[PDB]
Design a protein around this ligand. Structure first.
Ligand SMILES: [Mn+2]
Length: 129
């Protein structure tokens, strides 16, 4: 996956968390990044088209990460979009529920750029990107 212009959507209700993820992506060379504050905001942006990767917080108001993921996976236009779930605390039950709903990966925050890079590269490889 050599497309450094792959378009990311970073979804989290905390603006500071979004800025952290955006800055880590920038460090890796991924600058084509937009933000959303909950699952509905995210879906509105995704329908505008052009996105290549979603990084979503697990716990958000109104529409949480699991519901966002399910909605993406059920939509024929975006059903193959990579989705990386982010959580403050790994839980077996959540990991399995996310996998059942089609998550591409799952990672615990706070994470470093190196950890993010590894997550992304393993997802790109798993998905044949
Ligand atoms: Mn949150």
């Amino acid at each position: 996956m050599a497309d450094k212009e792959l378009k990311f959507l970073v979804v989290d209700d905390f603006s500071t968390m979004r800025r952290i993820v955006r800055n880590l992506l920038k460090e890796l060379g991924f600058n084509n990044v937009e933000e959303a504050e909950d699952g509905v905001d995210a879906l509105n942006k995704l329908q505008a088209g052009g996105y290549g990767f979603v990084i979503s917080d697990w716990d958000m108001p109104n529409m949480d990460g699991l519901e966002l993921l399910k909605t993406i996976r059920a939509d024929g236009a975006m059903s193959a979009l990579p989705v990386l779930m982010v959580t403050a605390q790994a839980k077996k039950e959540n990991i399995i529920a996310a996998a059942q709903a089609g998550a591409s990966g799952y990672v615990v925050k706070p994470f470093t750029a190196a950890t993010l890079e590894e997550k992304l590269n393993k997802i790109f490889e798993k998905l044949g990107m």
